[PDB]
Amino acid sequence: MKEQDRWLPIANVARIMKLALPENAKIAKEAKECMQECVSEFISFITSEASEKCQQEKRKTVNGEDILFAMTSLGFENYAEALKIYLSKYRE
């Protein structure tokens, strides 16, 4: 594994940040790097919870339902509810 692969690419992260702020706003390099680390931990944190439930149920594939379940388990109930219809429409 390459070390940069533990994180989402910083340019993409910073671009989403820029859209969330006023046009005159600036973002410190440290803030971009921090955000990059936070959103990457969000993926890994939720994934680990989903992975362990998958292993217990002797399933090899982490699916969308597993992500949603992990989200509510870990106290991201709003993320899970919002992404529920998104998953169902993807599946149809």
Partner: protein, 117 residues
């Protein structure tokens, strides 16, 4: 309630702003003609973050797609929450300390205790 995280720890006008953003997101997520290829974050990199964990074996295309959307929302709301502190300090530049301050307002962000001391 299921939406408590949206306003958790926010005061006054900020509550309305984050609520309205979430409403916008939810409305979009209900849209009938999604393009599941186009995202601000690359699906392959999301998958690679997931695969960094050796406990993860196989991954449905569903999972990075949900994360693509979820992570967009996560970055956006955390950035909006953090900007409050930059404005409070009469600054135009978002600093790391603004993100740390934002995280301190909701226990939803407790998972980042080690990431952002």
């Amino acid at each position: 309630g299921t939406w408590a995280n949206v306003n958790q720890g926010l005061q006054g006008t900020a509550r309305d702003i984050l609520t309205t953003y979430w409403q916008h997101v939810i409305n979009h997520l209900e849209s009938d003609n999604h393009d599941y290829k186009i995202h601000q974050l690359p699906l392959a990199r999301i998958k690679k973050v997931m695969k960094a964990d050796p406990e993860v074996k196989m991954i449905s295309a569903e999972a990075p797609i949900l994360f693509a959307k979820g992570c967009d929302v996560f970055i956006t709301e955390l950035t909006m929450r953090a900007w409050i502190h930059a404005e409070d300090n009469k600054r135009r530049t978002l600093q790391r300390s603004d993100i740390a301050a934002a995280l301190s307002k909701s226990d939803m962000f407790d998972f980042l205790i080690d990431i952002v001391p």
